């Protein structure tokens, strides 16, 4: 059982260290980024997860499920306007992926 936010920050320190270490070794391996971003979105620290998805798109911009997870985080967390920007950037960079257009018009 964790008490006041010193111990919560210690938990977060351990988890962030674990994920950043997995990112250091694998470097690519897109699931590592997705797990770390899902963990950040579960704790409503979604600016961290914006950073993680943007770093993952710096690694691999052509991976379509990564764009999908980033945009579904921003849709899910009621950030209509961020997600809308993401879909515009997604359909601009990867225009022959029809997934992006269907989900944005939906």
Whole-number minimum distance, CB 11 to RNA, in Å? 14
Site for RNA contains 14 (CB under 7 A): no
Question: Distance between CA 77 and CA 4 in Å, rounded?
Answer: 25
**Angle between helical axes of 64-76 and 80-93 (0-180°, round to 10):** 160
Of 12, 59, 82, 99, the residue at the interface with RNA (CB under 7 A) is: 99
Instruction: Using the minimum distance from each CB to RNA, give the nearer residue, 3 or 95.
Output: 95
For 21-49, b/e burial (b = at least 16 CB within 10 A) is: ebbeeeeeeeebbbebbebbbeeeebebb
Residue 1 is a binding residue for RNA (CB under 7 A): no
**In the complex with RNA, which residue's Cβ is closer, 3 or 54?**
54
10 binds RNA (CB under 7 A): no
Rounded Cα–Cα distance for residues 102 and 96 (Å): 12
- State the residues that interact with RNA by CB under 7 A: 20-21, 23-25, 27, 29-31, 34-35, 63-65, 68-69, 99
């Amino acid at each position: 059982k964790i008490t006041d936010e010193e111990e919560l920050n210690d938990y977060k320190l351990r988890k962030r260290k674990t994920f950043e270490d997995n990112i250091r070794k694998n470097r690519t391996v897109i699931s590592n980024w997705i797990k770390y971003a899902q963990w950040e979105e579960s704790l409503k620290e979604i600016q961290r997860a914006r950073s993680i998805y943007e770093r993952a798109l710096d690694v691999d911009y052509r991976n379509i499920t990564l764009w999908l997870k980033y945009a579904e985080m921003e849709m899910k967390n009621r950030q209509v306007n961020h997600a809308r920007n993401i879909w515009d950037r997604a359909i601009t960079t990867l225009p022959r992926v029809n997934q992006f257009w269907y989900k944005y018009t939906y």
